[PDB]
């Protein structure tokens, strides 16, 4: 099966969190987002 909605967005990094939340919530009105700072080793 496949998860509908934009399964992979572009790269709005630094494009304001709220902004990205609008594009993600607008593309997949069936998914929520969570804001969090950095800490764990993320894909460098």
């Amino acid at each position: 099966s496949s998860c509908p909605g934009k399964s992979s967005w572009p790269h709005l990094v630094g494009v304001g969190g709220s902004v990205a939340k609008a594009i993600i919530e607008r593309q997949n009105p069936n998914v929520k987002a969570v804001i969090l700072e950095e800490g764990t080793p993320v894909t460098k």
Binding site: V31, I35, E37
Partner: peptide
């Protein structure tokens, strides 16, 4: 719990929001 219904967004104190291009 990173499902296709939960998007995590990271933010670097540098004053930027590192949002993962993908969901989980």
């Amino acid at each position: 719990d990173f499902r296709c219904n939960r998007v995590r967004i990271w933010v670097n104190k540098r004053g930027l929001v590192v949002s993962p291009p993908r969901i989980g």
